[PDB]
Design a protein around this ligand. Sequence first.
Ligand SMILES: O=c1[nH]cc(F)c(=O)[nH]1
Lengths: 99, 102
Amino acid sequence: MLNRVVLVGRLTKDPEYRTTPSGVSVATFTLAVNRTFTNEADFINCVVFRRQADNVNNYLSKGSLAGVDGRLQSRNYENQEGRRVFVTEVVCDSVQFLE
Amino acid sequence: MLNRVVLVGRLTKDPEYRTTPSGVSVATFTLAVNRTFTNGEREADFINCVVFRRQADNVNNYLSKGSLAGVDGRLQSRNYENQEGRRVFVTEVVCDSVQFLE
Ligand SMILES: O=c1[nH]cc(F)c(=O)[nH]1
């Protein structure tokens, strides 16, 4: 079914590397996406698969402007405090490096 | 900045329909959005949506568990403390429009 999300925002921190529970490598970063209206940003976790993870970790850093096109994915997991965390993330088909 | 979400899916439950403390209609539901790829089995994503005003009224009046719907909106994050004292991070789709597809 149709699942498409597009964002332009600035990274809140330097991107990271991580391995999925199944051992697949990804890059992760958080995008601060300023709203168009007035009463503020939204903070959206993004996930890049395969070698695109290397472009993300080398070209972007905290404050970099980026654009993402991808799909929204839900998952959940138990954190270290033994707590069930529910997340909705953008799994990126492409990341555009705007600056 | 650019922030756009489009989804087609089916409601996992009857929408929840209420009037906020500002006086606006509010509707919430979870859209089960099937993935295009397959594992052979095909998995789904479960996206929390919220709609306000006339679109909320329409959602309550026409959508029910299992209904096919299309949403066009924006992705919003927020924070809250639960009664256990834990910070909970919320990501949901705030719908500008809902399309009824059945
Ligand atoms: O962050 C993630 N994105 C997609 C996945 F399939 C997963 O396991 N973890």
